[PDB]
Amino acid sequence: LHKEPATLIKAIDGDTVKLMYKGQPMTFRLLLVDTPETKHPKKGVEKYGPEASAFTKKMVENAKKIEVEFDKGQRTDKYGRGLAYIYADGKMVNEALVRQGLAKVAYVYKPNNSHEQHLRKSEAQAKKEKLNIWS
Numbered sequence: 001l002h003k004e005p006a007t008l009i010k011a012i013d014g015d016t017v018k019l020m021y022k023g024q025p026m027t028f029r030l031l032l033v034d035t036p037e038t039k040h041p042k043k044g045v046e047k048y049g050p051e052a053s054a055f056t057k058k059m060v061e062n063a064k065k066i067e068v069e070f071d072k073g074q075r076t077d078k079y080g081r082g083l084a085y086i087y088a089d090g091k092m093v094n095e096a097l098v099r100q101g102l103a104k105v106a107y108v109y110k111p112n113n114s115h116e117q118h119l120r121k122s123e124a125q126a127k128k129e130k131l132n133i134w135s
Contacts, residue, residue, distance in 0.1 A: 014052030
């Protein structure tokens with residue numbers, strides 16, 4: 001896998017950011033994580049949703065460099081969003097959220113599972129520390 005540069009356009013939610021990628025505006029869904037959402041009217045604003053959403057926002061707005069890393073399988077979902085690991089100054093946003101108890105590891109679809117083990121290990125530590133959704 002390789003990282004590629006991108007530029008932030010806007011953070012939309014805990015699990016979705018809009019980026020300029022290869023000079024095109026694109027919405028990205030963070031791979032392998034499920035955050036409580038502020039969007040979707042099924043429930044609307046879930047618990048820890050505003051917290052997950054602020055975390056991702058801060059982390060991408062305060063970065064010097066954002067990079068996107070596609071996995072080995074499909075690179076977009078059925079809504080047209082890119083599927084990727086997103087890095088802010090070298091730190092994966094997907095992992096940061098899970099490590100803080102602000103996301104769970106999602107149901108995985110092979111072969112888009114390259115960082116699955118690494119994320120599950122961070123999720124087990126956040127549960128053990130009883131952070132946020134695990135409190």
